[PDB]
């Protein structure tokens, strides 16, 4: 019905510039409203800007957190929304989502997935992917656990998977943690009881700052 | 260019079922919502239901959630109200109003003409139209006043026009009356004092029983 694909997140210098898009597929309303919402544990979920096309009308609106730093635009001919955020500060980091709803009293809004936006002086550091494998030790429960470490990478987005999505059962990707301006994490797979672990069971890690990886084992 | 046109009037015996359409035009049926309102005779406006013409999801007021089916046919930009097992109360004029957003809130901007659903067992029986000339009373001084009398008909909607567009003068069409499940109505037209009787004034009568009697009045 409606499908929302957004893109444009990344790492930028404080005081720098950012621009986020959002394409509304199969969204044929002439009268609706489009909003941008952001999220971060420093402040939870918070509204930033809203544009609204009610017959003859483009009425945009903003808050404290953005009055003068961000601006909303809306012109493909009829599909894309544009959040131009510049003069970005350190507290603008979060994941941004476009939310949409046609002008109906009763209506469900549509949300995209979001793109992370990281604001820092820290440059991009690629992830170092280390394969995990027991020896004799981990013969604990009856099953087979082996993992994959992901060292000090910088901007937070990331995609650790296994066999490119083949074996998606018994997986545990942990949240990233932060030691000194750098992130780290690990994924875990517990493949079938017997001794078929370590070969042709691949650890693929994706990190957007042009560094993709497929790693092996014991 | 934007207008909401409904179904014609309907007579239905109690227990029966009816479906009334309300078509859109001049605008896109799927970008604004729709309400169905009801007005009992003499009585007031009561909100029935509301509907999102996009997901086809209605929200009925409690007094109407039961034997009331509010549907829609998007392609043809028309909504429909279904009424099952009609009853005495089911007689009323039913209205579709478009829901519009204005200043943070909604209001029903464009309403439809209305629809008369009358439930009765009394058979449809076509009217007699009688032209009323004043002759042999010389009611000639100031101005002249002629009249039409339409007797015995059912249902209530009849269209009384004079010469189809003489109405600019003082036309007075009096509401019908119900005696022994028959209907009676009459119109009066006041014409140019001493000047029009030399030109034909006709009484035009249309009634949805395919009856159409245009009775001229000589004298």
């Amino acid at each position: 019905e409606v499908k929302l694909q957004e893109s444009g997140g990344g790492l930028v210098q404080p005081g720098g510039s950012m621009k986020l898009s959002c394409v509304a597929s199969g969204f044929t309303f002439n009268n609706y409203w489009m909003s941008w919402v952001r999220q971060s544990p420093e402040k939870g979920l918070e509204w930033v800007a809203e544009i609204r096309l009610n017959s003859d009308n483009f009425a945009t609106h903003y808050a404290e957190s953005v009055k003068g730093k961000f601006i909303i635009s809306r012109d493909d001919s009829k599909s894309r929304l544009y959040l131009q955020m510049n003069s970005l500060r350190a507290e603008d980091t979060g994941i941004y989502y476009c939310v949409l709803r046609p002008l109906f009293y009763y209506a469900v809004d549509y949300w995209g997935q979001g793109t992370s936006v990281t604001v820092s002086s820290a440059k991009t550091t690629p992830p170092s992917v280390y394969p995990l494998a027991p020896g004799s030790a981990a013969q604990t429960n009856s099953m087979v656990t082996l993992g994959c470490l992901v060292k000090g990478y910088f901007p937070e987005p990331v995609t650790v998977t296994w066999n490119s999505g083949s074996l998606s059962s018994g997986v545990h990707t942990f949240p990233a943690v932060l030691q000194s301006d750098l992130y780290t994490l690990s994924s875990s797979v517990t493949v079938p009881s017997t001794w078929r672990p370590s070969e042709t069971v691949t650890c693929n890690v994706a990190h957007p700052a042009s560094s993709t990886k497929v790693d092996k084992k014991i | 260019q934007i207008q909401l046109v409904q179904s014609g009037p309907e007579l239905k015996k109690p227990g029966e079922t009816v479906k009334i359409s309300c078509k859109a035009s001049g605008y896109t049926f799927t970008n604004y919502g729709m309400n169905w309102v009801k007005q009992a005779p003499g009585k007031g406006l009561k909100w029935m239901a509301w509907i999102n013409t996009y997901t086809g999801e209605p929200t009925y007021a409690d007094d109407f959630k039961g034997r009331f089916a509010f549907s829609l046919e998007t392609s043809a930009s028309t909504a429909y109200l279904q009424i099952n097992n009609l009853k005495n109360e089911d007689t009323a004029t039913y209205f579709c109003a478009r829901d519009g957003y204005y200043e943070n809130y909604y209001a029903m901007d464009y309403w439809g003409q209305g629809t008369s659903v009358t439930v009765s067992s009394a058979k449809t029986t076509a009217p007699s139209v009688y032209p009323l000339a004043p002759v042999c009373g010389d009611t000639t001084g100031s101005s002249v006043t002629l009249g039409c009398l339409v007797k015995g008909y059912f249902p209530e909607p009849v269209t009384l026009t004079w010469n189809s567009g003489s109405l600019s003068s003082g036309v007075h069409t009096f509401p019908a009356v119900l005696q022994s499940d028959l209907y009676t109505l009459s119109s009066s037209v006041t014409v140019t004092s001493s000047t029009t009787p030399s030109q034909s004034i006709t009484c035009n009568v249309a009634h949805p029983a395919s009856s159409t009697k245009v009775d001229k009045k000589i004298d």
Partner: protein, 214 residues
């Protein structure tokens, strides 16, 4: 549910004057209140949306006030046309409660009615009926004592009256009075009188006729 109660159901006000209509909500509905106006016969039009903003086409005459529980609509200077039932409507919570309405009865200067008595049509009597009708046009006040008289005393049964609501062009009422005899009862009587007893003349308007042939 949330009750919308209109202060006064009937409201009488003279042309050029000011009349404010109050309307109360049982639970705060904020400014999501609209005023519709309904002229007789025709369908209701939107006048004031969001409790303070006039709709397109509506004049600067029509105004509105209102906030949480109390709302008002004021026609600053009434006209002969502003005859109708004005309803208020909440559009906040689920059951969109409506108010009862308020009819405006414009007060005006007295007027005696033009009277016309009509003898039964030729075509009618051949078919069996004999309906004599009387139009008492353009009067004020509303009550009129219509009274017939056949061959002497008055007839009470056989009659059936009918009215129009205040005429929008001069704020005047009008009425039809029909008596229905059968061709038989009719040929047994010669004189017929239409008797309009009414307020603006201590003495009645009398229109009559008796069986002639024209």
């Amino acid at each position: 549910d949330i009750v919308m109660t209109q202060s006064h159901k009937f409201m009488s006000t003279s042309v050029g004057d000011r009349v404010s209509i109050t309307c109360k909500a049982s639970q705060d509905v904020s400014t999501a209140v609209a005023w519709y106006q309904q002229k007789p016969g025709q369908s209701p039009k939107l006048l004031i949306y969001s409790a303070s903003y006039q709709y397109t086409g509506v004049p600067d005459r029509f105004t509105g006030s209102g906030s949480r529980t109390d709302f008002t609509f004021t026609i600053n200077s009434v006209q002969a046309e502003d005859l109708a039932v004005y309803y208020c409507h909440q559009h906040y919570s689920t059951p969109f409660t409506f108010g009862s309405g308020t009819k405006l009865e414009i007060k005006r200067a007295d007027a005696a009615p033009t009277v016309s008595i009509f003898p039964p049509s030729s075509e009618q009597l051949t078919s069996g009926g004999a309906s004599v009708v009387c139009f008492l046009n353009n009067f004020y006040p509303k009550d009129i004592n219509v009274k017939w008289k056949i061959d002497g005393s008055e007839r009470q049964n056989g009659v059936l009256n009918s009215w129009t609501d205040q005429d929008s062009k001069d704020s005047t009422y009008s009425m039809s009075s029909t008596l229905t005899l059968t061709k038989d009862e009719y040929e047994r009587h010669n004189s017929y009188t239409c008797e309009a007893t009414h307020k603006t003349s201590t003495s009645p308007i009398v229109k009559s006729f008796n069986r002639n042939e024209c």
